[PDB]
Swiss-Prot record:
Interacts with the terminase subunits TRM1 and TRM2. Interacts with portal protein. Belongs to the herpesviridae TRM3 protein family. Component of the molecular motor that translocates viral genomic DNA in empty capsid during DNA packaging. Forms a tripartite terminase complex together with TRM1 and TRM2 in the host cytoplasm. Once the complex reaches the host nucleus, it interacts with the capsid portal vertex. This portal forms a ring in which genomic DNA is translocated into the capsid. TRM3 carries an RNase H-like nuclease activity that plays an important role for the cleavage of concatemeric viral DNA into unit length genomes. The lineage of its organism: Viruses, Duplodnaviria, Heunggongvirae, Peploviricota, Herviviricetes. This is Tripartite terminase subunit 3. The active site is at 34 (for nuclease activity), 106 (for nuclease activity), 202 (for nuclease activity). It comes from the Viruses. Coiled coil: none annotated. It is found in: Host nucleus. The chain holds residues 476 to 730 of 735 of the full protein.
Amino acid sequence: PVLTKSAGERFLLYRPSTTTNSGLMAPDLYVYVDPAFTANTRASGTGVAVVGRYRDDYIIFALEHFFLRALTGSAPADIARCVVHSLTQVLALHPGAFRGVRVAVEGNSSQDSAVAIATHVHTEMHRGPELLFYHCEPPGSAVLYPFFLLNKQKTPAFEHFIKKFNSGGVMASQEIVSATVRLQTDPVEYLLEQLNNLTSDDLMVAVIMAIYLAAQAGPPHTFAP
């Protein structure tokens, strides 16, 4: 019961309308993708979060809990198409708001598969805001790969999130985007069910890590239109 019920209820209910308060947003989007490369399993979901700064708080613009079709020949591109579709919708809902989107693809599962996802995201997004990837120089290597390795930074990320969430500093956009969590359950309600397991975690990890990335930060605001 790490996150208090009271903060959880407020997270569900009070959702700033981002499309009409764009002046309160920071001009950078942060996205984290926590991939699972299997199908026909309950822990085979890929988590995606796109978040940003709202005043000095953090707001979620989109969520995905994506399940590979079994025996596709293009799992990384299927995941990439999912994240690109999410981003696009977020971009279209807030036109001209963002100067940068920064994308982290967790590579713990497979570095090559994470790189492939980044490459497809890179290419598809090529059809304004600049797109950057988090890069990682694996131990013993001089190469900078466009994936993120989750290790020592997990405990600080979780610790900061819990403190921010409990004090009312993390919220969801009233016009939060989700293609994968729309028909069966409310995306914010679904995320909160995963979050209340703190003591399948792809969505929770993506959200907490996307926010941790945004939390290393700067000082301008999106324009007011």
